Amino acid sequence: GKIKRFFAKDMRAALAQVKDTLGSDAVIMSNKKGGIEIVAAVLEHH
Amino acid sequence: GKIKRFFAKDMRAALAQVKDTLGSDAVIMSNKKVNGGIEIVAAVL
To answer: B44, B27 in Cβ contact below 8 A?
Structure first.
């Protein structure tokens, strides 16, 4: 489990970064956007 | 860097306190569900 700011994709495509790095099960935070910014978080199960 | 323990009634608010203190990039060590809410142990370098 980790929390990452990822990258300023400037596009919702940044979600791909989140998936390729964090995975398919993730919690996205602060997607408040020159580019865009999004901090997401995966948890370690149980 | 450091390692800190966090509590919140919900997982969202616990993730928020981890962000407001450790920052946008951190390592989640623990997400155990404790009586009264959730405990998250996180670390940042």
So the answer is: yes
Tell me the residue range of the domain where B15 lies: 2-44
Residues of B with CB under 8 A from a CB of A: 11-12, 15-16, 18-19, 22, 24-31, 42
Q: Partners of B6 in the beta sheet?
A: B40
Interface with A, mutate which of B4, B25, B45 (most A CBs under 10 A): B25
Solved by what technique? X-ray
CB contact under 8 A, B31 and A39: no
Report how many domains make up chain B: 1
Resolution in A: 3.0
